[PDB]
Ligand binder design. Structure first.
Ligand SMILES: *[C@@H]1O[C@H](CO)[C@@H](O)[C@H](O)[C@H]1NC(C)=O
Ligand SMILES: *[C@@H]1O[C@H](CO)[C@@H](O)[C@H](O)[C@H]1NC(C)=O
Ligand SMILES: *[C@@H]1O[C@H](CO)[C@@H](O)[C@H](O)[C@H]1NC(C)=O
Ligand SMILES: *[C@@H]1O[C@H](CO)[C@@H](O)[C@H](O)[C@H]1NC(C)=O
Lengths: 54, 307, 439
């Protein structure tokens, strides 16, 4: 992998999370958006797994 | 042989009809001050009225001449003497040309700038690869500083980086051609708005993209069967004629202008066997940017990392 | 039945059971990333009637119309917006018709509806009855129009004209869009066209009665809609007045100027634990090092700031009235440190909305030491009413290029207002790229 931004990003997040699904709880404070990791700088499938619920 | 000496030293040139005095001549025993702010068709006619000028016994100055994308209308010019020269000893000078894309075609146009140096400023599309090759080719490499050929304002706008679009397949026909190129995508595919393909008749393999503006432009997008290779059919062809064809990717511009390279093919020369609107030009660029930024904001907002 | 805080629903349709009791959502609603397409109209919610912030839907698979799920959704107030939008419907892979057949006003903000590859019946809605500033609505990427196949009652729905398209208007194949007769003037109306109370929104249970309003035009209190907040009570966010003791009892607020605020404005201080009053420099700062301003939501983070001790990037592509709204969120900023940068901000004709700005401290310059830097902006015909400003850039230097409408006299006039005199080069403030298309 290198960088992902559009439909590719949500599709590979769904693929890696699968049925466990996504985490959410509104902050409030933030580090940086998922795009500033996986699109602009460098993506990692070890990080995409951390937006999943588990 | 025919000389072009004139009662003015500085033959300013504001129009095609101002060059008339030069029509059919070679050696201009003076200096020039080109100031062609606006016009059209001019290159096809200056190449008649002054496309034989071969030697200039002085400086050349080129100022505010936004009307022309290239100097290649000086088809024949082999030599600048600089026997008369500007303050700061500039004997070639190119200033504030809002749209100057290239100088002469350094693949076969030789030249020399004998007795002086040169200055470039504010020409925003004339990127340095076109002019360092002039320092190399026109006998002037060591004569001037890189404040004279400044890095910052000159060439800022132009996309002078060049990923290459390899032609994956080609198909001649009795009256048609079909060509294909690989699945090029920038680092973030939404930057790619479409491809544009340029084609023209080119009986001799010396042609360049910056002909007078002469090319015919056609557009095609990345296919919806995203696995398949891009490609196009062109029907505007004729028997046995040879065409140049080349493809240029049309891409967004952003703060990533330093990184949205765009792409260009090499020119491929192929012989047959024996419209847009200028508003949607920009409006779909806006539409794709104003979509892309919202989709980024949406992904930044929706996702938050687990414990 | 007032649910809260704002609800986010994701992963599986089983989360939607958390709406069973909601008549009002005092917050946003998200319904997104339901990949599974697992179920259908076992889930339906008669109760849901008002959403005080935006509604967001995204990538909800298997939903075929939104009016199976949310009938009776008479009003979306939009008290906070997503980007500029009180409703968003994005890449809804199967959404056929927008539904919402009983929706009758959207108070704040636009709507964005796009990439919904199968969505139709976006033509047949007369948004001018439901929304104003409809110039902002962005409905571009949906199903192409010839494929849309939009037909409905009569084609018994009233004809209407917008953009000279005089035609029937409707939400779905089954049911019309219907709107009040001008007998009501501004006011709402029932089914069978009985005119509603003046302090009523969307619809009413019965004509002209305090208890009959299903949603309210200003503020709801004690089961009745009212025009204004009663004495000894205080506005909570958006849409209701509340007891002071309630205002003290919510926990993860202060009464100021009659509002139960989350925090007391700049120049005022909370006198201890107080909540019944607050008495006469919100130095707000980093999350990212900079802040970038694409949208009105980007500015909302500043609404209480007045010193912004972080770098600022302005980036505003397009919006029809945000040239004013940003006077609220940003106009109170008096000092910016770091740098100010402004690029591609083609929506701006001026900076005048930064009405209180006074210093650009130059704390964290751009590459090349630029503390103020203005590039590529189309329009931006004028910076400021210079004749009475002060704006000194304490350190670092100005830069200006590609401002096609900015006359350089306005930039050279900055050095009489600003400093930046012996601190520049003519590579920075060039006479060439500025104002060449000016008038
Ligand atoms: C290319 O070669 C032909 C024949 O020598 C000549 O007429 C033409 O001017 C040359 N250059 C271009 C740009 O066509
Ligand atoms: C709805 O209200 C009833 C009665 O208070 C309660 O038992 C039930 O759990 C509530 N459900 C939700 C989803 O709030
Ligand atoms: C929606 O309600 C507000 C407040 O009652 C009103 O100002 C607005 O005009 C209504 N809708 C339209 C389309 O005007
Ligand atoms: C510009 O900024 C750098 C640090 O960013 C500083 O060290 C330098 O003194 C400044 N002045 C220059 C480069 O002329």
């Amino acid at each position: 992998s290198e960088t992902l931004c559009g439909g590719e990003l949500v599709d590979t997040l769904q693929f890696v999370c699968g049925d466990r699904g996504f985490y959410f709880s509104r902050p409030a404070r933030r580090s940086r958006g998922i795009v500033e990791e996986c699109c602009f700088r460098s993506c990692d499938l070890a990080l995409l797994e951390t937006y999943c619920a588990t | 042989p025919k000389v072009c000496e004139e009662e003015k030293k500085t033959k300013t040139i504001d129009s095609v009809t101002s060059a008339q005095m030069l029509q059919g001549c070679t050696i201009f025993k003076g200096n020039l001050l080109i100031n062609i702010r606006r016009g059209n068709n001019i290159a096809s006619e200056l190449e008649n009225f002054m496309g034989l000028i071969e030697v200039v016994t002085g400086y050349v100055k080129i100022r505010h001449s936004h009307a022309l994308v290239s100097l290649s209308f000086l088809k024949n010019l082999r030599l600048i003497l600089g026997e008369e020269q500007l303050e700061g000893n500039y004997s070639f000078y190119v200033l504030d040309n809002q749209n100057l894309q290239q100088l002469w075609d350094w693949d076969h146009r030789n030249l020399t700038i004998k007795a002086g140096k040169m200055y470039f400023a504010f020409n925003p599309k004339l990127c340095v690869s076109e002019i360092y090759r002039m320092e190399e080719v026109t006998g002037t490499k060591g004569r001037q500083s890189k404040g004279d050929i400044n890095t910052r304002n000159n060439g800022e706008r132009a996309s002078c980086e060049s990923d290459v679009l390899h032609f994956t397949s080609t198909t001649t026909s009795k009256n048609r051609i079909i060509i294909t190129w690989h699945r090029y995508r920038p680092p973030d595919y939404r930057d790619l708005i479409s491809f544009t393909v340029y084609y023209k008749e080119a009986p001799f393999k010396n042609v360049t993209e910056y002909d007078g503006q002469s090319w015919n432009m056609v557009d095609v997008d990345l296919p919806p069967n995203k696995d398949v290779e891009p490609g196009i059919l062109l029907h505007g062809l004729k028997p046995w004629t040879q065409y140049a064809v080349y493809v240029k990717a049309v891409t967004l511009t952003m703060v990533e202008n330093d990184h949205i390279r765009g792409a260009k093919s090499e020119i491929l020369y192929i012989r047959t066997n024996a419209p847009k609107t200028e508003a949607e030009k920009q409006a779909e660029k806006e539409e794709a940017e104003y979509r892309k930024v919202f989709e980024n904001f949406l992904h930044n907002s929706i996702f938050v990392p687990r414990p």
